[PDB]
């Protein structure tokens, strides 16, 4: 009968909200964006810093 | 060194509306931090490119390894047996490397150490100082690299920096005099990161980029061992002659076994 | 609070087109920066250090360590990095990527080819990307790309 | 009588660490044999013997 | 698969930390010495995680039942040598599986 | 088996039912041969003589 179904556990289907039943989802909820951290700099107190 | 970005307009509109980023400060932030990342890794590479191979000459017990401070060799670590009395012998070996560099430069003993993660960690898991044989969890230093590459002050004397992308376990000891002239490697900033921008009228798509100029040099007595210069007038830029395995205020020892 | 969710990951690639195959993430934690990317590497290409490549004094070679990143090596002794055996089977599986870099790491230990980097000569930087009749000297570019991941709840 | 419950197990991007770019710009975040089997760099597993 | 690559002390079994191998325990002879070597092995892995992730040193540990009591039967801090009754931690699974804070 | 599990050939894994098979359990929408999993309990006794 009236079954809500589910996506086919496929990246495309889940992203698009396409289901296999009646109701079609809007889309996945945005959980947040994760960047990559900036690596540190190993000082400059181990050499000369004479400007030109 | 220089770089160019040349982002698009339709991307700037879409990125602003969808995600909320800027698409302009992002590439500028990418470009600005990228160039300083090269230079920061650039100076360090020269230092390891110029360090004398340590634990040789007068810093070597009659015969142990001639080049590496093996943790599994009875001769190296003072015939020590258990863990808390064996990590201590590493402190003695580094201490020897400090006085020798003072002998070759005649300006002071080493006061900063560049070591990989494990070698820094093994210093944080032993009691550095006059005390019984001991070891434990790493508490004294910050072996974490995400926080900062600065372990701390070992023995109140040495400043321990951590080499992020170190290929093997090793440490490099060096000396830094109070005067800027007494370093052994000179970093010469000429022109800061000058920003540039433009836009071709065939597309109106913005283009931006950065340009900078810097110089690098070595201390005149970097090869302290020879009594005369090469050819009077000489090139201070490092090369396979003036700096490779010859600079004085830098001794580097590969640690094996940890 | 929804049947599905998504997570966004933003990366900074090296060179021109972001989604182009074979690009390398810029601020990688493991992989180190290509220190010559903004300098000499932006001027001339270097030979890729491979197995059984008899080096010559002064030449600069590049390699991508499986767990450290991109490095530039300036060999000081004429050696051929095949030494003992080709590949054959020296150990357990240990794909040649693991055997090659360990062989190179051995040479770095023995005072052979050493990691170096440098900027660019002002003769070439001044004319970068087309000027004074110069050609085919395009400066390196940097870009970013954004991807997604999705999860569907189970029961 | 009966009971029901729905949950979702997910992984975080950059887990593989070594890989510097994903495969299709839209990828199944749920864990999988090809995705994460001893590849997730967040966790390291060590045995002990002769305790 | 931990204890491999940069965290592998050469000559070990590459994945296991035997208490009957002098190399792994660094030649220790008595429980007050051998058990501390285990604490060092834990430290080595946590730093390695901070490399392959670039976010921080690991700060949570899942361990089997008895190997937790071993951590509770050694002087966790940096000191000469010690062992004895498992007092620092809660090895009782019935109370709560959260053993507690290590160091 | 325990030796193999150390080698990494086999590992513990726990998953959950796909929602499509969750709704269609023993009946609904015409599906067949999809029963649930059931849990009960039992009670047992013991006897104690009294010595003197």
Author numbering:
A (entry chain AG): 66 to 117
B (entry chain AG): 264 to 521
C (entry chain AD): 118 to 201, 201A, 201B, 201C, 201D, 201E, 201F, 201G, ...
D (entry chain AD): 471 to 521
E (entry chain AD): 316 to 418
F (entry chain AE): 212 to 263
Show me the paper's own sentences about this structure.
Here, we describe an AVV platform using phage T4. It contains a large 120 × 86 nm prolate icosahedral capsid (head) assembled with 930 molecules or 155 hexameric capsomers of the major capsid protein gp23* (* represents the cleaved mature form), 55 copies or 11 pentamers of gp24* at eleven of the twelve vertices, and 12 copies of the portal protein gp20 at the unique twelfth vertex. Since the T4 capsid has a high density of negative charges, ~6,829 net negative charges per capsid, we hypothesized that cationic lipids would spontaneously assemble on T4 capsid via electrostatic interactions.
Next, we asked if the T4 capsid can be re-wired by CRISPR engineering such that it can be further programmed with a large number of foreign peptides, 930 or one per gp23* capsid protein subunit, on the capsid exterior. We then introduced 9DE-gp23, 10am, 13am, Hoc-del, and Soc-del mutations into the genome through CRISPR to generate 9DE-T4 phage (9DE-gp23.10-amber.13-amber.HocΔ.SocΔ T4) and heads for AVV assembly. A 3.9 Å high-resolution cryo-EM structure of 9DE-T4 head was generated, which showed decoration of the capsid with 9DE peptides between residues G201 and A202 of the I domain loops. The 9DE-T4 heads bound strongly to anion-exchange columns requiring a much higher NaCl concentration to elute, and a slightly larger 9DE-gp23* band was also visualized by SDS-PAGE. A head-to-head comparison of WT-T4-AVVs and 9DE-T4-AVVs showed that packaging efficiency was not affected by acidification. Remarkably, however, head to head comparison of the AVVs assembled with the super-acidic heads exhibited ~5-fold greater transduction efficiency than the WT-AVVs, as measured by the delivered luciferase activity at MOIs of 103 and 104. Importantly, the enhanced transduction efficiency of the super-acidic AVVs was also recapitulated for delivery and expression of the full-length dystrophin payload.
